[PDB]
Amino acid sequence: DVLMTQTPLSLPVSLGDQASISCRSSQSIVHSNGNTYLEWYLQKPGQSPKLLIYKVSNRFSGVPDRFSGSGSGTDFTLKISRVEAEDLGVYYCFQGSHVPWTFGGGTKLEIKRADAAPTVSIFPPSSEQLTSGGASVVCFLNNFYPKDINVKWKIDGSERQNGVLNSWTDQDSKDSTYSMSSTLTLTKDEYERHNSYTCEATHKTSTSPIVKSFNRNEC
């Protein structure tokens, strides 16, 4: 039960940039046989993880000269010096020294770009859905940077916490931005009472929030 701690959770790096992932265990990971068993796996989206560095420093099959592993006892570090397209994904430091064998939380190597503000798009519940009995209110926050965002739902001004379901896309292959959907699910009876529906969004691009709203009157 060794606690593996990675730093950072998300790594924003440009291409050709020097990148360094930090791993730190709760205890000494030197196995009885003298060998330290620190491994580095790279899992690309929609794939099984693949080994890079084994035994703190040794490179695996087809792992380039660019990847280098270091550290001892507690603090360990992986260095990727000239970041390429193939080199992006989720990295995990693993230990084979003590049973139970444990993996790290994971570090996501992502590409940094210029700051971009989201495009909020509020969608009232469809005619097709209201006839059936439900009333989901969709909100899309599209193409923004950095990944960290926050959405507040305000029904008639009053904030709602419970009944919200959010999903986030990966980084864009083309424009390198993130997108987020936020669905406030409601019963028709609840929806048929209130009027103003607001999907208030906050992002570092601007000090004041990005309000997007509709009224149940017209639609």
Next chain:
Amino acid sequence: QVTLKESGPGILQPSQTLSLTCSFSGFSLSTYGIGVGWIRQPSGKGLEWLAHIWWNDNKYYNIALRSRLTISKDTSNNQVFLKIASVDTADTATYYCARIPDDHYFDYWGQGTTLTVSSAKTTAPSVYPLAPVCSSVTLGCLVKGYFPEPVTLTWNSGSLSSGVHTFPAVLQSDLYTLSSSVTVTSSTWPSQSITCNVAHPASSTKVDKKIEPRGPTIK
């Protein structure tokens, strides 16, 4: 050569017994030091080691689950079987089997079978079109209440690809939900029909949803 393929039930009811087979080629478990292990990855989260067996039949299990876990090899036909007893929604993950090349760690992982533990019954998706409230235009498509995963969504039968944002599925209640935004020039839509196509292989349900502009309706 080195290949690891894992066979699973893929989908089963709570409290049933999960039984999976890691079939392999390119190496034998009859060879020295060689070992095969099991790791599970829950739906977009970090990895977790379950158990493993060595060439000499020494079995190591996660102290966390232990009692439910039973691992056994079959040296003659290059197969390893992991069996977890009385499973629950907490065991909805992707299960990978990986080879241990002497030293304490994994080197070659397999494709990894995906298991889903749920009481839910097979349900076709309800496609809801999202037209904007009563230049560029943002349209949506809400696929709701389907089982099991996965669903495949396209716009204009794959013709429309630019500015498309399919979001990952969120477990609504006993069933999944997902959305996909599409952004087009104000001259493309309404003028030219935008149709959201959904396909649910499990329920053999292929649906086309023409997203028309939001019309008025008073009760």
